[PDB]
Write a protein that binds this ligand. Structure first.
Ligand SMILES: Cc1cc2nc3c(=O)[nH]c(=O)nc-3n(C[C@H](O)[C@H](O)[C@H](O)COP(=O)(O)OP(=O)(O)OC[C@H]3O[C@@H](n4cnc5c(N)ncnc54)[C@H](O)[C@@H]3O)c2cc1C
Ligand SMILES: Nc1nc2c(c(=O)[nH]1)N[C@H]1C(S)=C(S)[C@@H](COP(=O)(O)O)O[C@H]1N2
Ligand SMILES: Nc1nc2c(c(=O)[nH]1)N[C@H]1C(S)=C(S)[C@@H](COP(=O)(O)O)O[C@H]1N2
Ligand SMILES: O=C(O)c1ccccc1O
Ligand code: MOS
Ligand code: MOS
Ligand code: FES
Ligand code: FES
Ligand code: FES
Ligand code: FES
Lengths: 305, 745, 164, 102, 51, 50, 164
C-alpha cells in the first residue's frame, strides 16, 4: 500500500498510505483538505462552489480506522464509517450491562433516523465531528458525555474531552491548522450515570434551526442528588452549545418537580431566541428544548427508581 | 383478453435492470454539447448589464445565449406572456436570463456560475397578501353561485367563518426536467428527445422561438421518470433554451436539471389562501356557504386560470349545499410560475371544504361521520354548478370502508387510549371525495391514434398519450389486445411522437386511458373491418394468415383512430352545461398517533375504497391509488416549501424538503376497489384513476387534527366547541405548537 | 508522473490513467463507462437513485466486506482497488434477472421506474450481507431510497419473500 | 403547416418535390406550407420498394386521397368562414376537435 | 423484415428511416440489406450503435 | 398550383451547399463503432477454417 | 517531441498537435472537423466527390496560387501552412449561397446531389483563377468530376452565364 497522487483540472489529490505521510502532508500543507466519505466536501464543492486544490485521503491509514476496547470506553479511528460505529455499539449494547452502555445507547439513537444505509457506510465519524455543523446530531452527544478526542499533528499528540470550547465559532473547531483528529473514544457509562438523546423530527434549513441534543446526568451514590449535569444542544445557535449556566444551578440538587421547572426556566432564558433568529420556528424551537429535557427528566426518574 | 387482469407494467422488468432508457441515458453524439441555464438571483429588478468576461475563460466554454440570439420570437408561454430569455427585467428569482453552452456539463456549470449580472432591484410582490395589497392579479375574478346566500345565512342557526391557507408542493419526480435537441441542418429541422407530457406545446414553442413552421420540429417522448403535472408545460423552459443552443451552434445539445435548479425554476403546486363562512343548523346540516379562493400564481399565467376553475368546481366535495357562492383570484407575484400538479386545484378546494366541514361537526358537538353523511349528496342530485350526479357511489364506498376498517370499534379503542395516555393521543377520521373527470377546457378532450400491422402480423401501436409511470402504454396494449382479439405479445408500443399523432393534448387530467383507449379501439375496429373478408374465406386460418392475405390482396394495414369526449361545455355565465364526463369516487379512513411533546406522529393504519369502475388493470389501479394517496399524505403532513422574505427558496433538495419515505406510510395500508360498479361513460367501463385518490391523503391530516384536539382538551382550556386553525402542511412544528401546555407557555 | 487509478466495475478491471479528483463515481459510470443504469436524482445523497454496491478487502476482518453507497458523492479517487457493482452487474432481460429484479418487477414495485435500480441495489446489498433478513432489516435497507410513484407498499411486499 | 409522409423514397429523381407539388395543388395551398422530411417504417408500413418508375403514380395518388380526406373535414369551416384563411379554418377545425391527421 | 428475421424479433421492433440516397438506380432495392443486416447484428451483439 | 411548372428539386440548394445530410454525414455517437465486411477470395470453395 | 501541423480550413486556423501521416484530408474534414460537405465517392481520385480548393503562397511567383484537389488522396501532413476551402466555406442556405451554388441549384444541375459539392468546388476554383472563363475552360474544369444522375447537360448550361 504505497502513497498515490492524482492530478486533475483544478485539484490535486493524495492517497496517504501512512500516518507519517499524513502528518507530513498536513504539516507541509495546512490548508489541504482531508476527505474520507466526501458526504460533506462533495456538497461544499457542488452546491457551495468551493475549490480546494489540495486534498488528502487517509482512509487507508491503520489508526483512524482502529477499534479498541478499553477500560474507559470503546475507541474508533476518526475515519471509521458510522455504520461501523453503529455495529460495534450494537454488540456492546447486547453484551455489556445496561448501566455501562448508556452513552452508547444515545449515539445509536441519533444514528437511527439518520440519512440512510448509503450515507452511514461512507460517512466517517471524524468527518461528522470536524464539519462542526450547527445541526450535527452527534456532537451534542459527544459533548454532553465529554467524549475523548485524541488529536494529532506530526510530532505533537494530545487527548481531551469534547466541550463547549471545542467549537469556537460557526464551522470552526479547536483543531490546529496542521492538526488532524486521529481517534475518538465513546465513554462507558458509570453507575448513577444516565444518558438521553433526542432530535427534531424535521429539517427545513441547510444547517441551522433543527433542535438536536445530548443529555447526561450523574447522581451521588445511592441518592437522588445531582453530582454532574450536561445539557448540550444543536440547532439552537451557529454551533453546538451547552446550557452550562443552567446545569450548574442544579449540582448537588435533588431530582424532583422543583428541579424540572428550575431547569426549564433556565433553558427558556439561557437558550433564548430573538424574533429575528436565523432559521425561524422560534416558538417551536424553544418548546423542543424544554420538551426534550422533560423527557430526559421523566426517563431519569424511571432509571432512578 | 387481459383486460381486468393485474398485468404488471410492460417496462417494469427493464426498469428493474436499468435497461429502460430515459432521456439522459441516450448516448451523446461525438459532438454533443452541454447547456446550463443562467438564473436570476433577485425576485424583481432591472438587468443593468451582463458580464461574461470570466465565463469566457473557463475551459471548454462555447458561448452565452441571450434574448438577442433568438432568431424567431422571444415571446412564449401558454398565454404568450413570458420570455424564453429575460431581456430588461426579471420577475422572479429563478428567472432564466440566459444559458452557457460548453463541451462538458461541468464546464457549463462552472462557467454559468461565474456569469456576472448587475441588477437594480424593483418593488417585489411575494405573498398572496402582498398581491392583494397591490391589486396584483391575472385577469378577473372567477365565481360559481347557486341559490341565494342571505335566506340561508339567516335561516342558519350557527354561522362560522375564517381564513385558511394550504402550502404549495414540489412535484419531485425522481427524474428532473431534461431535453436533447438535434439540429438536422436542413430547412430548420430539429429532432428533440424530451421528458414531457406535452409533445405538442413543446413542438410549437420551439418552432415559435426559432421562427419556423411547426412541421420542422419533431418531438419524441419515450418515457418520463415521473411527471405528475410538472412536465405538462414548464418542461418547455428547458426545451426552448436547448433548441436555441442547437440552432445557434448547429450542434446536438442537451441539458438535465439538477434537483436544486428544478425545484427553483420549474414551479409547482399552487398555494391557496382562503376566507370562508358557513351557515348551518345545530343538526350539522349546511344551508349556506361562502369561500374566496386566492392562489399564488407566480410570474406568468400558465394553467393558473383553469386550476382555479377546477378548485371552484370542487369547493363542494361530496356535500349538497342549497345556497352556495365561491370565488377565485389568481395572484400575480414575483415567484416562479406555479403550474399543474396531480389534482389540478381540486386538492386545495377539497381541503378547504373539509376544513369548514370538520368545524361544523365540532361546533355542533356531533360525531364527524354523522355530519358529513348528513350533508352528503344523494343519487340524482346536482352540484353547485348544476351537473346531475349519476351513478353516485360514495355511499357504497363509505359504508364499506367503515365496515372493513372496523371504524366504530376502533373509534372506541382510540378514545380509551386518549384517556389512558397523557402526552400521546390518537386520531381517527374517515373522508369521502369525488373528482370531476375531464379537461375543463372543452377542446382538449380529443385523442388520436395510429396503428400499423406489419406483414408478420406484429402490431405497432402509437397514440397521443405519454408514459410517466402510470402505465398508460400497458393499458393501451391491453385494450388493443382485446379489441383485435390477439395476444398482447403481438402488439407493441415504442414511444410518443409528433410525427405519428399530431396536435395531441398533454397527457393529463387523468383522461388518457379514457380517450386514447377509445382512439386505439376505433383504429383496431377499422383494421378488423379490413381483415373481415379474409377471416371468412379462411376461418381456421391464423391471424398471421389473414394479415398476409390482406397485404397480398393489397389491403391497407395502417389506420388512424380518433375520439372526442361527448356532451361537454360548462359556462361561467348561465352556470350550466356539463363540465365533466363523469366523476370518480373514493373514501379513506386513517388513524394516527401524535406525540404532544415533539410534534411528531405515526400513521398507524389507513383503509381506502376507490370506485374505479371495472378496472382495465387492477394492479395498476391500486398502485395509482396508493401513490396518489402518498403524495397526498405528503402534501398535507410532510412537504413544506420555504422561501426567504426576498422570495428566494431555501428548501432546494431532499435534505430540506421531505417527501414521504418508506417508513412514512401507514403500518396497516389496505386498498380496495369497489366491486360491481361499471362506468358506461368510459372504455370497457373503466374510470380515470390518476388524480382522484390524492385528496384522500387528507384523511391523515384530519386524524392528526383529531388528536391535536384531544391534546388540547387535555393540557389546555376546556372549550368543547372551540375552533383552532391548522393550515397545511401539518408539520411537526404546527402540531407541537398546537399542543398547548405548560411548556409552550 | 501521475499514479494510475485502478478499480473494478461489474467484475471488469478499469484502469484510469488520468483520474480527476473532482470526478464522482456516478459521472464516471454514466459517461466514461456508458452504464446508465445508475441515475442522478438529487446529487446530495438523499434519494438513492444513484445507489451501487462497493466491495473492498479489509486488512483486519480478513473477509471482503460489502456495503451500499451513493455514487453521486463517491469520488473515484477513493476507489482504488475497490470493486463496484451496478444494477447491470447483477442481471438483465437480455440474459437473466437477479431474483431481486424479478421480484420487484412482478410485485408492481416499479412505476415510472427511475428509482428502481437504486432500490434493487440497496436490496441486493442487504442479501449480500444477510441471505435471509428480517422484515425490519429489509425495511431499513431503504432508509436512503426515495420513490414518488408507488407509495412504497408494493416494494416492501415483494421483498417479504426473502425474510424469515 | 403540413407534414407529408409516404412510402416512397428520394434518390435524386425528385419524388418528394413532385408529391409536394401534388399536395400543394390538391389542398390548394402554397407549396411553402407543405413539407416532407423523410421516409420511415413507422409512418407508412409494408411499403413496396421505391421502384419500377411508378412512385409518382402511386404515392401521388395516395397523397391526393389523404388531401381529399383533409379537405372534407375542413369543408364545414370553409363554409362558415369563406373569407377566412387556411390557417383560420385549420385552427377552427382543431378547436372544434376535428382530426387533422389522415 | 430482414433485420428482424436475422435477430429473430417481431418486425414491430425495427424502425428503418430513409432521408435520401446519393443515387440508387435499383442497386439499393434489395442488395442494400447485405450491409444492413451485418451492421444490425453488430449493433445487437455489441449493444453499440454501429455504422 | 405549381403542377406542370419547372420547380427545381426542393433540396437542390442544400445539396449545392453540402448541408443536405446523407446517411454517413449523420454525426457518430460518442460510442459508435465501425464494421468492415470480410469477403471471400474464391468463387466456390469450402471454408476449412477462419 | 513532435512538430505541430498547422493549416487552415474555411479561414479558421487548425492546429493538429499529433498529426498522423496516414490521415487523408477527407477523413480529417469529415471526422475531426465535422464538415461533411465533402464526400467520399471512390477513394482513388477519379470522381471528384471529395474536391476542395487548396491555396498556398509560393516563394517565387509571389502571389498565393489557388488549385483544386482530391481530398481523398491528400495527406494532411502535406498541408502545413496551406489553406483549405470546402463547399461550406463559400456559402450556405442559413446565410447566402455563392453564385456557383445558386446557379447549379436553379439550373437543375443537381439531382441526388452527392456529386454537387465537388463540382461546385471545381467551378469555384476556376472562377478564382479566372473571373470570366471560356465555355471550353468551364468544361475542362470538370475533367475529374463524375455525376451519374444529370447527364451533365444542365450543369454546363447553368455555368454558361459565367463565360464570355
Ligand atoms: C443525505 C445525507 C443525510 C445526513 N444526515 C445527517 C444527520 O442526520 N445528522 C448528522 O449529524 N449528520 C448528518 N449528515 C452528515 C454526515 O454525517 C457528514 O457529512 C459526514 O459524516 C462527513 O464525513 P465524511 O467522511 O463523509 O467526510 P468528508 O466529506 O470527507 O468531510 C469531512 C470534513 O471534516 C474534515 N475531516 C475529515 N476527516 C478528518 C480527520 N480524521 N481529522 C481532521 N479533520 C477531518 C475535512 O477536512 C472536512 O472539513 C448527512 C449527509 C448526507 C449526504
Ligand atoms: N407513476 C406515475 N403515476 C401518475 C403520474 C406520474 O407522473 N407517474 N402523473 C399523475 C397525473 S398528475 C395525471 S394528470 C395522470 C396521468 O394520466 P393518465 O391520464 O393516463 O391516467 O396520472 C397520474 N399518475
Ligand atoms: N437522380 C436519380 N434518378 C433516378 C434513380 C436514382 O437513383 N437517381 N433511380 C431510377 C430507377 S432505377 C427507378 S425504378 C425510378 C425511381 O422512381 P420513381 O418511381 O419515382 O420515378 O427512378 C429512376 N430515376
Ligand atoms: O381540467 C383540468 O384538469 C385540466 C388539466 C390540465 C390542463 C387543462 C385542464 O383543463
Ligand atoms: O397534473 Mo396531471 O392534469 S398532468
Ligand atoms: O431499378 Mo428501378 O425497378 S429501382
Ligand atoms: S442522486 Fe440522490 S442520493 Fe445520489
Ligand atoms: S417508480 Fe417512480 S419514483 Fe419509484
Ligand atoms: S472520392 Fe473519388 S476522387 Fe476522391
Ligand atoms: S446528382 Fe447524383 S451524381 Fe450528380
Amino acid at each position: 500500500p504505497k502513497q498515490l497522487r492524482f492530478e486533475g483540472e483544478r485539484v490535486t489529490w493524495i492517497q496517504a498510505s501512512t500516518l507519517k505521510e499524513l502528518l507530513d502532508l498536513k504539516a507541509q500543507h495546512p490548508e489541504a483538505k482531508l476527505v474520507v466519505g466526501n458526504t460533506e466536501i462533495g456538497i461544499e464543492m457542488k452546491f457551495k462552489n468551493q475549490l480546494f486544490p489540495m486534498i488528502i485521503c487517509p482512509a487507508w491509514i491503520p489508526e483512524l480506522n482502529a477499534v479498541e476496547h478499553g477500560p474507559e470506553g470503546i475507541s474508533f479511528g476518526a475515519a471509521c464509517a458510522l455504520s461501523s460505529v453503529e455495529k460495534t455499539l450494537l454488540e456492546a449494547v447486547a453484551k455489556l450491562p445496561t448501566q455501562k452502555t448508556e452513552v452508547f445507547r444515545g449515539v445509536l439513537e441519533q444514528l437511527r433516523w439518520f440519512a440512510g444505509k448509503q450515507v452511514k457506510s461512507v460517512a466517517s465519524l471524524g468527518g461528522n465531528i470536524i464539519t462542526a455543523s450547527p445541526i450535527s446530531d452527534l456532537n451534542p452527544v459527544f459533548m454532553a458525555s465529554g467524549t475523548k478526542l485524541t488529536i494529532v499533528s506530526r510530532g505533537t499528540r494530545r487527548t481531551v474531552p469534547m466541550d463547549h470550547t471545542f467549537f469556537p465559532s460557526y464551522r470552526k473547531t479547536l483543531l490546529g491548522p496542521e492538526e488532524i483528529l486521529l481517534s475518538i473514544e465513546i465513554p462507558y457509562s458509570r453507575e448513577d450515570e444516565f444518558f438521553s438523546a433526542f432530535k427534531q423530527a424535521s429539517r427545513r434549513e441547510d444547517d441551522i434551526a433543527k433542535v438536536t441534543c445530548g443529555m447526561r446526568v450523574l447522581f451521588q451514590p445511592g441518592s437522588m442528588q445531582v453530582k454532574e449535569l450536561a445539557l448540550c444542544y444543536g440547532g439552537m445557535a451557529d454551533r453546538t452549545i451547552s446550557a452550562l449556566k443552567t446545569t450548574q444551578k442544579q449540582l448537588s440538587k435533588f431530582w424532583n418537580e422543583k428541579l424540572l421547572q428550575d431547569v426549564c426556566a433556565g433553558l427558556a432564558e439561557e437558550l433564548s431566541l430573538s424574533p429575528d433568529a436565523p432559521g425561524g420556528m422560534i416558538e417551536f424551537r424553544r418548546t423542543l428544548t424544554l420538551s426534550f429535557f422533560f423527557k430526559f427528566y421523566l426517563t431519569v426518574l424511571k432509571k432512578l427508581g | 383478453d387481459t383486460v381486468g387482469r393485474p398485468l404488471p407494467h410492460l417496462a417494469a422488468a427493464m426498469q428493474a435492470s436499468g435497461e429502460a432508457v430515459y432521456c439522459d441515458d441516450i448516448p451523446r453524439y461525438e459532438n454533443e454539447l452541454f447547456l446550463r441555464l443562467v438564473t436570476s438571483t433577485r425576485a424583481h429588478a432591472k438587468i443593468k448589464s451582463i458580464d461574461v468576461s470570466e465565463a469566457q475563460k473557463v475551459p471548454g466554454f462555447v458561448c452565452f445565449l441571450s434574448a438577442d440570439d433568438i432568431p424567431g420570437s422571444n415571446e412564449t408561454g401558454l398565454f404568450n406572456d413570458e420570455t424564453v430569455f429575460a431581456k430588461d427585467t426579471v420577475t422572479c428569482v429563478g428567472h432564466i436570463i440566459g444559458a452557457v453552452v460548453a463541451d462538458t456539463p461541468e464546464h457549463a456549470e462552472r462557467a454559468a456560475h461565474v456569469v456576472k449580472v448587475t441588477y437594480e432591484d424593483l418593488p417585489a410582490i411575494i405573498t398572496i397578501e402582498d398581491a392583494i395589497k397591490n391589486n396584483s392579479f391575472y385577469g378577473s375574478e372567477l365565481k360559481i353561485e347557486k341559490g341565494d346566500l342571505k335566506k340561508g345565512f339567516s335561516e342558519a342557526d350557527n354561522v362560522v367563518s375564517g381564513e385558511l391557507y394550504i402550502g404549495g408542493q414540489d412535484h419531485f419526480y425522481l427524474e428532473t426536467h431534461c431535453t436533447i435537441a438535434i439540429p438536422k441542418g436542413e430547412e430548420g429541422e430539429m429532432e428533440l428527445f424530451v421528458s414531457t407530457q406535452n409533445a405538442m406545446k413543446t413542438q410549437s414553442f420551439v418552432a415559435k422561438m426559432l421562427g419556423v413552421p411547426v412541421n420542422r420540429i419533431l418531438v419524441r417522448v419515450k418515457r418520463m421518470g415521473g411527471g405528475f403535472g410538472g412536465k405538462e408545460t414548464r418542461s418547455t423552459l428547458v426545451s426552448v433554451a436547448v433548441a436555441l443552443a442547437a440552432y445557434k451552434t448547429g450542434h446536438p445539445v442537451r441539458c438535465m436539471l439538477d434537483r436544486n435548479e428544478d425545484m427553483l425554476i420549474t414551479g409547482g403546486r399552487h398555494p391557496f389562501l382562503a376566507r370562508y363562512k358557513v351557515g348551518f343548523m345545530k343538526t350539522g346540516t349546511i344551508v349556506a356557504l361562502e369561500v374566496d379562493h386566492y392562489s399564488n400564481a407566480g410570474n406568468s399565467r400558465d394553467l393558473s386560470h383553469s386550476i382555479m376553475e377546477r378548485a371552484l368546481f370542487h369547493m363542494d366535495n361530496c356535500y349538497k349545499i342549497p345556497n352556495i357562492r365561491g370565488t377565485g383570484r389568481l395572484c400575480k407575484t414575483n415567484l416562479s410560475s406555479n403550474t399543474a400538479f396531480r389534482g389540478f386545484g381540486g386538492p386545495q378546494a377539497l381541503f378547504i371544504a373539509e376544513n369548514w366541514m370538520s368545524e361544523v361537526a365540532v361546533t355542533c358537538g356531533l360525531p364527524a361521520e354523522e355530519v358529513r353523511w348528513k350533508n352528503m349528496y344523494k343519487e340524482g342530485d346536482l352540484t353547485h354548478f348544476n351537473q346531475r350526479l349519476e351513478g353516485f357511489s360514495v355511499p357504497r364506498c363509505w359504508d364499506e370502508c367503515l365496515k372493513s376498517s372496523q371504524y366504530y370499534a376502533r373509534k372506541s379503542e382510540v378514545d380509551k387510549f386518549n384517556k389512558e395516555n397523557c402526552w400521546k393521543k390518537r386520531g381517527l377520521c374517515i373522508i369521502p371525495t369525488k373528482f370531476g373527470i375531464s379537461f375543463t377546457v372543452p377542446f382538449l378532450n380529443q385523442a388520436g391514434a395510429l396503428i400499423h400491422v406489419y406483414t408478420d402480423g406484429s402490431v405497432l401501436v402509437s397514440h397521443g398519450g405519454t408514459e410517466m409511470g402510470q402505465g398508460l402504454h400497458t393499458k393501451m396494449v391491453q385494450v388493443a389486445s382485446k379489441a383485435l382479439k390477439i395476444p398482447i405479445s403481438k402488439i407493441y408500443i415504442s414511444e410518443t411522437s409528433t410525427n405519428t399523432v399530431p396536435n395531441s393534448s398533454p397527457t393529463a387530467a387523468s383522461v388518457s386511458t379514457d380517450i386514447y383507449g377509445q382512439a386505439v379501439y376505433e383504429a383496431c375496429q377499422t383494421i378488423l373491418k379490413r381483415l373481415e373478408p379474409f377471416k371468412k374465406k379462411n376461418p381456421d386460418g391464423s391471424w398471421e394468415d389473414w394479415v398476409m392475405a390482406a397485404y397480398q390482396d393489397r389491403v391497407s394495414l395502417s389506420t388512424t383512430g380518433f375520439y372526442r369526449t361527448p356532451n361537454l361545455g360548462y359556462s361561467f355565465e348561465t352556470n350550466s352545461g356539463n363540465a365533466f364526463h363523469y366523476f370518480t369516487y373514493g373514501v379513506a379512513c386513517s388513524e394516527v398517533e401524535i406525540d404532544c411533546l415533539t410534534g411528531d406522529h405515526k400513521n398507524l393504519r389507513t383503509d381506502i375504497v376507490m370506485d374505479v369502475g371495472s378496472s382495465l388493470n387492477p394492479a395498476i389501479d391500486i398502485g395509482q391509488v396508493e401513490g396518489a394517496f402518498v403524495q397526498g399524505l405528503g402534501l398535507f403532513t410532510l412537504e413544506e416549501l420555504h422561501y426567504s422574505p426576498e422570495g428566494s427558496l431555501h428548501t432546494r433538495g431532499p435534505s430540506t424538503y421531505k417527501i414521504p419515505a418508506f417508513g412514512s406510510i401507514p403500518t396497516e395500508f389496505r386498498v380496495s376497489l369497489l366491486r360491481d360498479c361499471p362506468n358506461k361513460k368510459a372504455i370497457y367501463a373503466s374510470k380515470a384513476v390518476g388524480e382522484p385518490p390524492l385528496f384522500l391523503g387528507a384523511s391523515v391530516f384530519f386524524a392528526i387534527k383529531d388528536a391535536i384536539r384531544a391534546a388540547r382538551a387535555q393540557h389546555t382550556n376546556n372549550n368543547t366547541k372551540e375552533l383552532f386553525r391548522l393550515d397545511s402542511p401539518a408539520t411537526p412544528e404546527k402540531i407541537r405548537n398546537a399542543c398547548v401546555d405548560k411548556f409552550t407557555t | 508522473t501521475a499514479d494510475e487509478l485502478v478499480f473494478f466495475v461489474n467484475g471488469k478491471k478499469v484502469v484510469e490513467k488520468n483520474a480527476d479528483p473532482e470526478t464522482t463515481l456516478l459521472a464516471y459510470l454514466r459517461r466514461k463507462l456508458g452504464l446508465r443504469g445508475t441515475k442522478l436524482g438529487c446529487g446530495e445523497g438523499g434519494c438513492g437513485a444513484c445507489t451501487v454496491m462497493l466491495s473492498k478487502y479489509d486488512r483486519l476482518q480478513d473477509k471482503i466486506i460489502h456495503f451500499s453507497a451513493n455514487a453521486c458523492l463517491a469520488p473515484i479517487c477513493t476507489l482504488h482497488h475497490v470493486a463496484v457493482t451496478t444494477v447491470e452487474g447483477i442481471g438483465s432481460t437480455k440474459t437473466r434477472l437477479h431474483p431481486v429484479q424479478e421480484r420487484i418487477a412482478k410485485s408492481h414495485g416499479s412505476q415510472c421506474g427511475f428509482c428502481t435500480p437504486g432500490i434493487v441495489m440497496s436490496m441486493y446489498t442487504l442479501l449480500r450481507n444477510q441471505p435471509e433478513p428480517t422484515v425490519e432489516e429489509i425495511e431499513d435497507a431503504f432508509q436512503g431510497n426515495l420513490c414518488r410513484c408507488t407509495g412504497y407498499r408494493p416494494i416492501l411486499q415483494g421483498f417479504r419473500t426473502f425474510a424469515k
